[PDB]
Amino acid sequence: QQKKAAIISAEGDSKAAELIANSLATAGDGLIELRKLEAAEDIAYQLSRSRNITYLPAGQSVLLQLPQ
Amino acid sequence: KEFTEAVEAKQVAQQEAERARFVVEKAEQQKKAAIISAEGDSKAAELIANSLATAGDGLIELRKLEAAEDIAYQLSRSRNITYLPAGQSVLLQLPQ
Amino acid sequence: KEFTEAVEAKQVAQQEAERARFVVEKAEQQKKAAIISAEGDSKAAELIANSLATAGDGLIELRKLEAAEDIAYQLSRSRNITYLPAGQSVLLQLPQ
Amino acid sequence: KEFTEAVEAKQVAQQEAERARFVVEKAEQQKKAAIISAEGDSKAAELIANSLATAGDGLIELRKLEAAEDIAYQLSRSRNITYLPAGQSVLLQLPQ
Amino acid sequence: REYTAAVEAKQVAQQEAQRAQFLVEKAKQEQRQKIVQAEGEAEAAKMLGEALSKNPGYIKLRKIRAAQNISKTIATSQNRIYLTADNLVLNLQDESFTRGSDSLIKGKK
Amino acid sequence: REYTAAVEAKQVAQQEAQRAQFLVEKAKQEQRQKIVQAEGEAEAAKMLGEALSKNPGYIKLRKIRAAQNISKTIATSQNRIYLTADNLVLNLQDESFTRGSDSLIKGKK
Numbered sequence A: 001q002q003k004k005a006a007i008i009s010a011e012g013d014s015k016a017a018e019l020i021a022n023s024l025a026t027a028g029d030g031l032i033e034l035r036k037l038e039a040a041e042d043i044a045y046q047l048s049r050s051r052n053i054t055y056l057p058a059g060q061s062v063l064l065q066l067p068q
Numbered sequence B, C, D: 001k002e003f004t005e006a007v008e009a010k011q012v013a014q015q016e017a018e019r020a021r022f023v024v025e026k027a028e029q030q031k032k033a034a035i036i037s038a039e040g041d042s043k044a045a046e047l048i049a050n051s052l053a054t055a056g057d058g059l060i061e062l063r064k065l066e067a068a069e070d071i072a073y074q075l076s077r078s079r080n081i082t083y084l085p086a087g088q089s090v091l092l093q094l095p096q
Numbered sequence E, F: 001r002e003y004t005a006a007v008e009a010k011q012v013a014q015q016e017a018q019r020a021q022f023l024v025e026k027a028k029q030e031q032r033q034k035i036v037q038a039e040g041e042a043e044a045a046k047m048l049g050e051a052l053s054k055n056p057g058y059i060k061l062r063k064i065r066a067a068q069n070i071s072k073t074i075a076t077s078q079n080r081i082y083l084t085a086d087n088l089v090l091n092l093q094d095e096s097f098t099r100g101s102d103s104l105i106k107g108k109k
Helices: A002-026 A031-041 B002-054 B059-071 C002-055 C058-062 C069-077 D002-054 D058-062 D069-074 E002-052 E057-074 F002-052 F057-070
Strands: none
Touching: A002 A031, B002 E002, B002 E057, B059 E057, C002 C058, C002 E002, C002 F002, C002 F057, C058 E002, C058 E057, C058 F057, C069 E057, D002 D058, D002 F002, D058 F002, D058 F057, D069 F057, E002 E057, E002 F057, F002 F057
Protein backbone atom coordinates (compact mmCIF):
# COMPACT_ATOMS: atom_id res chain seq x y z
CA GLN A 1 0.00 0.00 0.00
CA GLN A 2 2.84 2.38 0.83
CA LYS A 3 4.46 1.48 -2.50
CA LYS A 4 1.50 2.88 -4.29
CA ALA A 5 0.62 6.05 -2.52
CA ALA A 6 3.96 6.84 -0.88
CA ILE A 7 5.37 6.98 -4.38
CA ILE A 8 2.35 9.24 -4.77
CA SER A 9 3.09 11.15 -1.52
CA ALA A 10 6.38 11.88 -3.18
CA GLU A 11 4.57 12.79 -6.41
CA GLY A 12 2.81 15.50 -4.39
CA ASP A 13 5.82 16.87 -2.52
CA SER A 14 7.95 16.22 -5.60
CA LYS A 15 5.84 18.13 -8.11
CA ALA A 16 5.51 21.01 -5.70
CA ALA A 17 9.25 20.52 -6.13
CA GLU A 18 9.19 20.02 -9.93
CA LEU A 19 7.40 23.29 -10.52
CA ILE A 20 9.50 25.27 -8.02
CA ALA A 21 12.58 23.60 -9.47
CA ASN A 22 11.84 24.69 -13.02
CA SER A 23 10.72 28.02 -11.54
CA LEU A 24 14.02 28.81 -9.84
CA ALA A 25 16.32 27.08 -12.34
CA THR A 26 14.82 29.25 -15.07
CA ALA A 27 15.04 32.44 -12.99
CA GLY A 28 16.25 31.93 -9.40
CA ASP A 29 15.17 32.07 -5.78
CA GLY A 30 11.81 33.82 -6.10
CA LEU A 31 9.58 32.56 -3.30
CA ILE A 32 12.47 31.07 -1.39
CA GLU A 33 13.29 34.77 -0.96
CA LEU A 34 9.88 36.45 -0.73
CA ARG A 35 9.17 33.87 1.92
CA LYS A 36 12.63 34.38 3.32
CA LEU A 37 10.91 37.65 4.24
CA GLU A 38 7.45 36.29 5.08
CA ALA A 39 9.12 33.43 6.94
CA ALA A 40 11.39 36.09 8.37
CA GLU A 41 8.30 37.31 10.16
CA ASP A 42 7.03 33.82 11.00
CA ILE A 43 9.88 31.29 10.92
CA ALA A 44 12.54 33.82 11.99
CA TYR A 45 10.37 34.51 14.93
CA GLN A 46 10.80 30.76 15.31
CA LEU A 47 14.41 31.56 14.39
CA SER A 48 14.79 34.83 16.27
CA ARG A 49 14.01 32.92 19.45
CA SER A 50 17.24 31.45 18.08
CA ARG A 51 19.38 33.20 20.66
CA ASN A 52 22.99 33.66 19.51
CA ILE A 53 22.17 34.82 15.99
CA THR A 54 25.41 35.88 14.35
CA TYR A 55 26.40 36.61 10.78
CA LEU A 56 29.66 36.10 8.96
CA PRO A 57 31.58 37.45 5.96
CA ALA A 58 32.65 35.27 3.04
CA GLY A 59 33.77 35.57 -0.56
CA GLN A 60 37.31 36.25 0.70
CA SER A 61 39.93 34.36 2.70
CA VAL A 62 37.70 34.84 5.73
CA LEU A 63 39.38 33.54 8.89
CA LEU A 64 37.00 33.02 11.80
CA GLN A 65 37.39 33.32 15.58
CA LEU A 66 33.89 32.18 16.51
CA PRO A 67 32.44 32.16 20.01
CA GLN A 68 34.00 30.56 23.03
CA LYS B 1 38.62 -19.96 55.23
CA GLU B 2 40.04 -18.69 51.94
CA PHE B 3 40.28 -22.24 50.54
CA THR B 4 36.49 -22.48 50.34
CA GLU B 5 36.35 -19.11 48.57
CA ALA B 6 38.99 -20.20 46.05
CA VAL B 7 37.09 -23.43 45.37
CA GLU B 8 33.92 -21.36 44.95
CA ALA B 9 35.65 -19.16 42.36
CA LYS B 10 36.85 -22.28 40.53
CA GLN B 11 33.29 -23.62 40.49
CA VAL B 12 32.09 -20.24 39.20
CA ALA B 13 34.54 -20.57 36.31
CA GLN B 14 33.22 -24.07 35.60
CA GLN B 15 29.65 -22.74 35.57
CA GLU B 16 30.77 -20.05 33.13
CA ALA B 17 32.07 -22.95 31.03
CA GLU B 18 28.61 -24.54 31.03
CA ARG B 19 27.01 -21.18 30.22
CA ALA B 20 29.47 -20.97 27.32
CA ARG B 21 28.27 -24.37 26.11
CA PHE B 22 24.79 -22.93 25.88
CA VAL B 23 26.32 -19.85 24.30
CA VAL B 24 27.67 -22.28 21.68
CA GLU B 25 24.12 -23.22 20.86
CA LYS B 26 22.83 -19.63 21.11
CA ALA B 27 25.68 -18.85 18.72
CA GLU B 28 24.39 -21.36 16.16
CA GLN B 29 20.98 -19.78 16.43
CA GLN B 30 21.98 -16.17 16.09
CA LYS B 31 24.27 -17.29 13.27
CA LYS B 32 21.09 -17.87 11.39
CA ALA B 33 18.88 -15.19 12.85
CA ALA B 34 21.40 -12.35 13.23
CA ILE B 35 22.64 -12.84 9.69
CA ILE B 36 19.05 -12.52 8.61
CA SER B 37 17.91 -9.77 11.03
CA ALA B 38 20.75 -7.91 9.39
CA GLU B 39 19.26 -9.06 6.07
CA GLY B 40 16.04 -7.25 7.02
CA ASP B 41 17.22 -3.88 8.34
CA SER B 42 20.05 -4.11 5.86
CA LYS B 43 17.76 -4.62 2.83
CA ALA B 44 15.84 -1.55 3.77
CA ALA B 45 19.42 -0.41 3.22
CA GLU B 46 19.95 -2.41 -0.04
CA LEU B 47 17.17 -0.68 -1.88
CA ILE B 48 17.69 2.78 -0.44
CA ALA B 49 21.34 2.31 -1.48
CA ASN B 50 20.47 1.44 -5.07
CA SER B 51 17.70 4.06 -5.35
CA LEU B 52 20.27 6.67 -4.37
CA ALA B 53 23.30 5.34 -6.23
CA THR B 54 21.11 5.89 -9.28
CA ALA B 55 19.88 9.40 -8.43
CA GLY B 56 21.16 10.82 -5.15
CA ASP B 57 19.96 11.65 -1.67
CA GLY B 58 16.17 11.69 -1.76
CA LEU B 59 14.80 10.60 1.58
CA ILE B 60 16.70 12.72 4.10
CA GLU B 61 15.91 15.74 2.11
CA LEU B 62 12.22 15.05 2.68
CA ARG B 63 13.19 13.73 6.10
CA LYS B 64 15.50 16.53 6.96
CA LEU B 65 12.03 17.99 6.86
CA GLU B 66 9.95 15.25 8.53
CA ALA B 67 12.67 14.18 10.96
CA ALA B 68 13.32 17.88 11.49
CA GLU B 69 9.82 18.22 12.86
CA ASP B 70 10.14 15.07 14.95
CA ILE B 71 13.68 14.24 15.96
CA ALA B 72 14.93 17.79 15.42
CA TYR B 73 12.41 18.63 17.97
CA GLN B 74 14.64 16.08 19.62
CA LEU B 75 17.23 18.61 18.34
CA SER B 76 15.42 21.70 19.32
CA ARG B 77 16.62 20.47 22.69
CA SER B 78 20.23 20.66 21.41
CA ARG B 79 21.43 23.76 23.23
CA ASN B 80 24.35 24.81 21.00
CA ILE B 81 23.61 24.81 17.28
CA THR B 82 25.85 26.36 14.61
CA TYR B 83 26.11 25.55 10.88
CA LEU B 84 29.52 24.66 9.13
CA PRO B 85 31.36 26.15 6.14
CA ALA B 86 33.57 24.22 3.78
CA GLY B 87 35.13 24.51 0.35
CA GLN B 88 37.29 27.34 1.71
CA SER B 89 40.24 27.59 4.12
CA VAL B 90 38.01 27.74 7.20
CA LEU B 91 39.78 28.34 10.51
CA LEU B 92 38.20 28.30 13.96
CA GLN B 93 38.03 29.21 17.60
CA LEU B 94 35.19 27.43 19.37
CA PRO B 95 33.29 27.11 22.66
CA GLN B 96 35.23 26.50 25.84
CA LYS C 1 67.11 -12.03 56.42
CA GLU C 2 68.35 -12.63 52.87
CA PHE C 3 69.84 -16.08 53.60
CA THR C 4 66.61 -17.91 54.45
CA GLU C 5 64.78 -15.77 51.90
CA ALA C 6 67.36 -16.73 49.26
CA VAL C 7 67.08 -20.43 50.09
CA GLU C 8 63.28 -20.30 49.97
CA ALA C 9 63.49 -18.26 46.76
CA LYS C 10 65.70 -20.92 45.17
CA GLN C 11 63.33 -23.70 46.25
CA VAL C 12 60.19 -21.79 45.20
CA ALA C 13 61.97 -20.89 41.97
CA GLN C 14 62.70 -24.53 41.16
CA GLN C 15 59.09 -25.40 41.91
CA GLU C 16 58.02 -22.43 39.78
CA ALA C 17 60.51 -23.30 37.03
CA GLU C 18 59.04 -26.77 36.58
CA ARG C 19 55.54 -25.39 37.13
CA ALA C 20 56.50 -22.74 34.56
CA ARG C 21 57.66 -25.21 31.96
CA PHE C 22 54.15 -26.53 32.38
CA VAL C 23 52.92 -22.91 32.44
CA VAL C 24 54.58 -22.31 29.07
CA GLU C 25 52.57 -25.33 27.98
CA LYS C 26 49.53 -23.76 29.67
CA ALA C 27 50.44 -20.54 27.86
CA GLU C 28 50.41 -22.26 24.48
CA GLN C 29 46.96 -23.62 25.37
CA GLN C 30 45.73 -20.33 26.86
CA LYS C 31 46.99 -18.64 23.71
CA LYS C 32 44.97 -21.00 21.58
CA ALA C 33 42.10 -19.75 23.76
CA ALA C 34 43.04 -16.05 23.70
CA ILE C 35 43.92 -16.11 20.00
CA ILE C 36 40.56 -17.70 19.27
CA SER C 37 38.66 -15.19 21.47
CA ALA C 38 40.44 -12.04 20.32
CA GLU C 39 39.76 -13.67 16.96
CA GLY C 40 36.11 -14.10 17.75
CA ASP C 41 36.44 -10.36 17.58
CA SER C 42 38.98 -10.34 14.78
CA LYS C 43 37.48 -13.13 12.59
CA ALA C 44 34.18 -11.41 12.77
CA ALA C 45 36.55 -8.68 11.63
CA GLU C 46 38.15 -10.61 8.76
CA LEU C 47 34.77 -11.70 7.41
CA ILE C 48 33.79 -8.02 7.63
CA ALA C 49 37.01 -7.29 5.74
CA ASN C 50 36.04 -9.75 3.03
CA SER C 51 32.53 -8.31 2.86
CA LEU C 52 33.84 -4.75 2.47
CA ALA C 53 36.62 -5.71 0.05
CA THR C 54 34.44 -7.75 -2.31
CA ALA C 55 31.40 -5.49 -1.92
CA GLY C 56 33.32 -2.25 -1.44
CA ASP C 57 33.38 0.29 1.34
CA GLY C 58 29.62 0.11 1.93
CA LEU C 59 29.62 -0.49 5.68
CA ILE C 60 33.15 0.79 5.95
CA GLU C 61 31.37 4.13 5.80
CA LEU C 62 27.99 2.92 7.05
CA ARG C 63 29.40 1.62 10.30
CA LYS C 64 31.34 4.86 9.95
CA LEU C 65 27.85 6.41 9.89
CA GLU C 66 25.70 4.08 12.02
CA ALA C 67 28.49 3.88 14.57
CA ALA C 68 29.05 7.58 13.88
CA GLU C 69 25.76 7.96 15.70
CA ASP C 70 27.87 6.65 18.59
CA ILE C 71 29.84 9.90 18.47
CA ALA C 72 26.78 12.02 19.17
CA TYR C 73 25.50 9.34 21.58
CA GLN C 74 28.63 9.04 23.64
CA LEU C 75 31.09 11.93 23.15
CA SER C 76 29.96 14.11 26.05
CA ARG C 77 29.28 11.91 28.94
CA SER C 78 32.27 14.20 29.39
CA ARG C 79 31.90 17.95 28.66
CA ASN C 80 34.64 19.09 26.25
CA ILE C 81 34.45 16.96 23.07
CA THR C 82 34.44 18.61 19.63
CA TYR C 83 36.26 18.60 16.27
CA LEU C 84 37.91 20.89 13.66
CA PRO C 85 37.61 20.88 9.82
CA ALA C 86 40.55 19.82 7.65
CA GLY C 87 41.80 20.74 4.21
CA GLN C 88 42.06 24.10 5.96
CA SER C 89 44.15 26.13 8.42
CA VAL C 90 42.33 25.66 11.75
CA LEU C 91 43.55 27.70 14.73
CA LEU C 92 42.97 24.79 17.10
CA GLN C 93 42.60 25.95 20.71
CA LEU C 94 41.32 23.27 23.08
CA PRO C 95 38.70 24.31 25.67
CA GLN C 96 39.19 24.99 29.37
CA LYS D 1 83.53 13.23 64.41
CA GLU D 2 84.74 12.80 60.83
CA PHE D 3 87.70 10.78 62.13
CA THR D 4 85.76 7.76 63.38
CA GLU D 5 83.22 8.15 60.58
CA ALA D 6 85.94 8.02 57.91
CA VAL D 7 87.80 5.09 59.50
CA GLU D 8 84.52 3.17 59.68
CA ALA D 9 84.03 4.18 56.05
CA LYS D 10 87.44 2.68 55.20
CA GLN D 11 86.57 -0.69 56.72
CA VAL D 12 83.11 -0.57 55.14
CA ALA D 13 84.81 0.25 51.83
CA GLN D 14 87.00 -2.86 52.06
CA GLN D 15 84.07 -5.14 52.77
CA GLU D 16 81.90 -3.43 50.14
CA ALA D 17 84.68 -3.62 47.54
CA GLU D 18 85.09 -7.39 47.83
CA ARG D 19 81.33 -7.78 48.27
CA ALA D 20 80.74 -5.75 45.11
CA ARG D 21 83.28 -7.64 43.01
CA PHE D 22 81.20 -10.70 43.67
CA VAL D 23 78.02 -8.62 43.31
CA VAL D 24 79.30 -7.94 39.79
CA GLU D 25 79.63 -11.69 39.23
CA LYS D 26 76.18 -12.32 40.73
CA ALA D 27 75.14 -9.43 38.49
CA GLU D 28 76.48 -11.25 35.45
CA GLN D 29 74.00 -13.92 36.44
CA GLN D 30 71.35 -11.27 37.24
CA LYS D 31 72.00 -9.34 34.01
CA LYS D 32 71.28 -12.57 32.21
CA ALA D 33 68.11 -12.95 34.32
CA ALA D 34 67.03 -9.33 33.75
CA ILE D 35 67.80 -9.61 30.04
CA ILE D 36 65.56 -12.64 30.43
CA SER D 37 62.57 -10.82 31.96
CA ALA D 38 63.16 -8.04 29.45
CA GLU D 39 63.26 -11.05 27.10
CA GLY D 40 59.76 -11.96 28.11
CA ASP D 41 58.89 -8.52 26.87
CA SER D 42 61.51 -7.98 24.11
CA LYS D 43 61.16 -11.49 22.64
CA ALA D 44 57.46 -11.12 22.46
CA ALA D 45 58.78 -8.02 20.67
CA GLU D 46 61.09 -10.01 18.35
CA LEU D 47 58.22 -12.25 17.33
CA ILE D 48 55.92 -9.22 16.95
CA ALA D 49 58.49 -7.40 14.81
CA ASN D 50 58.91 -10.49 12.64
CA SER D 51 55.13 -10.91 12.46
CA LEU D 52 54.47 -7.33 11.40
CA ALA D 53 57.41 -7.10 8.99
CA THR D 54 56.14 -10.28 7.32
CA ALA D 55 52.44 -9.35 7.48
CA GLY D 56 52.44 -5.58 7.15
CA ASP D 57 51.03 -3.21 9.72
CA GLY D 58 47.76 -4.94 10.61
CA LEU D 59 48.08 -4.61 14.37
CA ILE D 60 50.51 -1.74 14.18
CA GLU D 61 47.34 0.13 13.32
CA LEU D 62 44.94 -2.22 15.13
CA ARG D 63 46.60 -1.75 18.47
CA LYS D 64 46.29 1.83 17.24
CA LEU D 65 42.58 1.07 16.77
CA GLU D 66 41.61 -1.88 19.03
CA ALA D 67 43.98 -0.96 21.85
CA ALA D 68 43.53 2.67 20.87
CA GLU D 69 40.32 2.04 22.79
CA ASP D 70 42.74 2.14 25.72
CA ILE D 71 43.28 5.82 24.87
CA ALA D 72 39.66 6.56 25.72
CA TYR D 73 39.72 4.05 28.59
CA GLN D 74 42.58 5.80 30.35
CA LEU D 75 43.34 9.32 29.09
CA SER D 76 40.71 10.81 31.37
CA ARG D 77 41.07 9.37 34.84
CA SER D 78 42.22 12.97 35.08
CA ARG D 79 40.15 15.76 33.54
CA ASN D 80 42.47 17.70 31.22
CA ILE D 81 43.67 15.30 28.50
CA THR D 82 42.76 15.44 24.82
CA TYR D 83 43.41 14.32 21.23
CA LEU D 84 43.36 16.90 18.41
CA PRO D 85 43.82 17.29 14.61
CA ALA D 86 46.74 18.49 12.50
CA GLY D 87 47.45 18.61 8.78
CA GLN D 88 46.34 22.23 9.08
CA SER D 89 47.69 25.47 10.54
CA VAL D 90 46.74 24.18 13.99
CA LEU D 91 47.77 26.80 16.55
CA LEU D 92 47.32 24.65 19.64
CA GLN D 93 46.27 25.93 23.03
CA LEU D 94 46.14 23.83 26.17
CA PRO D 95 43.88 24.62 29.10
CA GLN D 96 44.16 25.77 32.70
CA ARG E 1 53.69 -20.11 50.85
CA GLU E 2 54.89 -19.92 47.25
CA TYR E 3 56.34 -23.45 47.50
CA THR E 4 53.11 -25.25 48.37
CA ALA E 5 51.39 -22.81 46.02
CA ALA E 6 53.80 -23.72 43.21
CA VAL E 7 53.44 -27.48 43.68
CA GLU E 8 49.65 -27.38 43.98
CA ALA E 9 49.69 -25.07 40.96
CA LYS E 10 51.74 -27.62 38.99
CA GLN E 11 49.26 -30.42 39.72
CA VAL E 12 46.33 -28.07 39.12
CA ALA E 13 48.32 -27.07 36.02
CA GLN E 14 48.22 -30.60 34.62
CA GLN E 15 44.49 -30.85 35.26
CA GLU E 16 44.09 -27.25 34.05
CA ALA E 17 45.99 -27.96 30.83
CA GLN E 18 43.41 -30.65 30.19
CA ARG E 19 40.79 -28.05 31.09
CA ALA E 20 42.78 -25.62 28.89
CA GLN E 21 42.16 -27.77 25.84
CA PHE E 22 38.57 -27.69 27.06
CA LEU E 23 39.04 -23.90 27.17
CA VAL E 24 40.27 -23.95 23.58
CA GLU E 25 36.96 -25.55 22.65
CA LYS E 26 34.96 -23.06 24.75
CA ALA E 27 36.94 -20.17 23.24
CA LYS E 28 36.29 -21.44 19.72
CA GLN E 29 32.68 -21.12 20.80
CA GLU E 30 33.24 -17.54 21.96
CA GLN E 31 35.07 -17.17 18.65
CA ARG E 32 31.80 -18.01 16.93
CA GLN E 33 29.81 -15.67 19.21
CA LYS E 34 31.92 -12.64 18.38
CA ILE E 35 32.40 -13.78 14.78
CA VAL E 36 28.63 -13.47 14.59
CA GLN E 37 28.22 -10.19 16.43
CA ALA E 38 30.51 -8.53 13.94
CA GLU E 39 29.14 -10.81 11.18
CA GLY E 40 25.70 -9.35 11.51
CA GLU E 41 27.78 -6.21 11.22
CA ALA E 42 29.37 -7.94 8.20
CA GLU E 43 26.07 -8.87 6.55
CA ALA E 44 25.34 -5.17 6.67
CA ALA E 45 28.85 -4.76 5.24
CA LYS E 46 28.66 -7.21 2.33
CA MET E 47 25.33 -5.93 1.13
CA LEU E 48 26.07 -2.25 1.73
CA GLY E 49 29.11 -2.63 -0.46
CA GLU E 50 27.22 -4.44 -3.19
CA ALA E 51 24.53 -1.74 -3.17
CA LEU E 52 26.84 1.27 -2.75
CA SER E 53 30.19 0.49 -4.36
CA LYS E 54 28.21 1.01 -7.57
CA ASN E 55 27.79 4.60 -6.39
CA PRO E 56 27.59 5.54 -2.69
CA GLY E 57 23.93 6.53 -2.71
CA TYR E 58 22.76 5.39 0.70
CA ILE E 59 26.23 6.42 1.76
CA LYS E 60 25.63 9.93 0.45
CA LEU E 61 22.20 9.79 2.08
CA ARG E 62 23.64 8.21 5.24
CA LYS E 63 26.33 10.78 5.63
CA ILE E 64 23.29 13.03 5.55
CA ARG E 65 21.23 10.85 7.91
CA ALA E 66 24.22 10.17 10.17
CA ALA E 67 24.83 13.90 10.30
CA GLN E 68 21.13 14.22 11.13
CA ASN E 69 21.26 11.42 13.72
CA ILE E 70 24.57 12.74 15.04
CA SER E 71 22.88 16.09 15.47
CA LYS E 72 19.83 14.27 16.86
CA THR E 73 21.83 12.76 19.71
CA ILE E 74 24.07 15.82 19.98
CA ALA E 75 20.87 17.18 21.49
CA THR E 76 21.41 15.07 24.62
CA SER E 77 25.14 15.50 24.07
CA GLN E 78 26.63 18.29 26.15
CA ASN E 79 29.54 18.11 23.71
CA ARG E 80 30.94 21.49 22.75
CA ILE E 81 31.21 20.23 19.23
CA TYR E 82 29.80 22.81 16.87
CA LEU E 83 29.27 23.67 13.36
CA THR E 84 30.31 27.00 11.87
CA ALA E 85 29.17 29.54 9.19
CA ASP E 86 28.02 28.59 5.75
CA ASN E 87 26.92 25.14 4.46
CA LEU E 88 23.46 24.18 5.72
CA VAL E 89 23.25 27.37 4.04
CA LEU E 90 21.63 29.68 6.52
CA ASN E 91 23.32 32.48 4.81
CA LEU E 92 19.79 31.90 3.63
CA GLN E 93 20.38 34.51 0.91
CA ASP E 94 23.69 33.80 -0.84
CA GLU E 95 25.44 32.19 -3.78
CA SER E 96 26.72 29.76 -1.16
CA PHE E 97 23.01 29.16 -0.63
CA THR E 98 23.12 27.87 -4.22
CA ARG E 99 26.47 26.26 -3.34
CA GLY E 100 25.18 24.35 -0.32
CA SER E 101 21.67 23.65 -1.55
CA ASP E 102 22.71 23.42 -5.20
CA SER E 103 25.76 21.62 -3.86
CA LEU E 104 23.29 18.71 -3.91
CA ILE E 105 24.16 18.65 -7.61
CA LYS E 106 25.80 15.37 -8.57
CA GLY E 107 29.43 16.00 -9.41
CA LYS E 108 29.43 18.50 -6.58
CA LYS E 109 28.36 15.48 -4.53
CA ARG F 1 76.72 -1.63 60.12
CA GLU F 2 77.97 -1.98 56.54
CA TYR F 3 81.04 -4.12 57.36
CA THR F 4 79.33 -7.34 58.46
CA ALA F 5 76.54 -6.44 56.04
CA ALA F 6 79.00 -6.41 53.13
CA VAL F 7 80.72 -9.64 54.21
CA GLU F 8 77.39 -11.45 54.52
CA ALA F 9 76.46 -9.84 51.21
CA LYS F 10 79.52 -11.42 49.58
CA GLN F 11 78.62 -14.86 50.94
CA VAL F 12 74.92 -14.53 50.09
CA ALA F 13 76.11 -13.20 46.71
CA GLN F 14 77.91 -16.45 46.05
CA GLN F 15 74.63 -18.13 46.95
CA GLU F 16 72.69 -15.60 44.85
CA ALA F 17 75.00 -15.92 41.85
CA GLN F 18 74.11 -19.59 41.90
CA ARG F 19 70.47 -18.56 42.38
CA ALA F 20 70.93 -15.85 39.71
CA GLN F 21 71.85 -18.36 37.05
CA PHE F 22 68.86 -20.10 38.59
CA LEU F 23 67.05 -16.81 37.94
CA VAL F 24 68.26 -17.03 34.36
CA GLU F 25 66.34 -20.31 34.30
CA LYS F 26 63.25 -19.31 36.32
CA ALA F 27 62.86 -15.89 34.72
CA LYS F 28 63.51 -17.70 31.43
CA GLN F 29 60.40 -19.71 32.15
CA GLU F 30 58.52 -16.55 33.12
CA GLN F 31 60.18 -15.12 29.99
CA ARG F 32 58.50 -17.75 27.86
CA GLN F 33 55.30 -17.04 29.80
CA LYS F 34 55.52 -13.26 29.22
CA ILE F 35 56.68 -13.91 25.64
CA VAL F 36 53.51 -15.95 25.30
CA GLN F 37 51.32 -13.22 26.82
CA ALA F 38 52.66 -10.43 24.64
CA GLU F 39 52.69 -13.09 21.89
CA GLY F 40 48.97 -13.65 22.13
CA GLU F 41 49.12 -9.92 21.62
CA ALA F 42 51.55 -10.76 18.79
CA GLU F 43 49.22 -13.40 17.34
CA ALA F 44 46.55 -10.76 17.21
CA ALA F 45 49.36 -8.88 15.47
CA LYS F 46 50.10 -11.63 12.94
CA MET F 47 46.47 -12.52 12.28
CA LEU F 48 45.52 -8.87 11.69
CA GLY F 49 48.62 -8.16 9.59
CA GLU F 50 48.03 -11.05 7.23
CA ALA F 51 44.30 -10.34 7.17
CA LEU F 52 44.26 -6.59 6.65
CA SER F 53 47.65 -5.30 5.45
CA LYS F 54 47.12 -6.51 1.88
CA ASN F 55 44.15 -4.14 1.84
CA PRO F 56 42.67 -2.74 5.07
CA GLY F 57 39.06 -3.79 4.59
CA TYR F 58 38.28 -4.44 8.20
CA ILE F 59 41.17 -2.23 9.20
CA LYS F 60 39.14 0.44 7.46
CA LEU F 61 36.05 -0.79 9.28
CA ARG F 62 38.15 -0.88 12.45
CA LYS F 63 39.45 2.60 12.12
CA ILE F 64 35.68 2.88 12.22
CA ARG F 65 34.57 0.44 14.93
CA ALA F 66 37.58 1.26 17.13
CA ALA F 67 37.16 5.00 16.78
CA GLN F 68 33.67 4.06 17.96
CA ASN F 69 34.96 1.70 20.65
CA ILE F 70 37.19 4.61 21.62
CA SER F 71 33.99 6.68 21.51
CA LYS F 72 32.14 3.86 23.17
CA THR F 73 34.81 4.50 25.81
CA ILE F 74 34.82 8.32 25.53
CA ALA F 75 32.41 8.13 28.48
CA THR F 76 35.34 7.77 30.86
CA SER F 77 36.92 10.32 28.49
CA GLN F 78 36.57 13.62 30.25
CA ASN F 79 39.05 14.35 27.47
CA ARG F 80 38.55 17.58 25.65
CA ILE F 81 39.10 16.58 22.05
CA TYR F 82 39.02 17.48 18.39
CA LEU F 83 38.17 15.20 15.54
CA THR F 84 37.98 16.94 12.18
CA ALA F 85 34.78 18.50 10.84
CA ASP F 86 35.06 16.94 7.40
CA ASN F 87 35.34 13.68 9.33
CA LEU F 88 31.79 13.70 10.57
CA VAL F 89 31.22 15.76 7.45
CA LEU F 90 28.54 17.80 9.15
CA ASN F 91 28.79 19.73 5.87
CA LEU F 92 25.39 18.44 4.84
CA GLN F 93 24.81 21.11 2.18
CA ASP F 94 28.32 21.28 0.74
CA GLU F 95 30.53 20.49 -2.21
CA SER F 96 32.95 18.59 0.05
CA PHE F 97 30.08 16.91 1.88
CA THR F 98 30.43 13.82 -0.30
CA ARG F 99 34.02 14.43 -1.07
CA GLY F 100 34.28 13.02 2.44
CA SER F 101 32.24 9.89 1.71
CA ASP F 102 31.80 9.52 -1.91
CA SER F 103 35.33 8.42 -1.17
CA LEU F 104 33.37 5.18 -0.93
CA ILE F 105 34.34 5.16 -4.58
CA LYS F 106 37.66 3.49 -3.85
CA GLY F 107 40.64 5.62 -4.79
CA LYS F 108 39.47 8.62 -2.83
CA LYS F 109 39.64 6.20 0.09
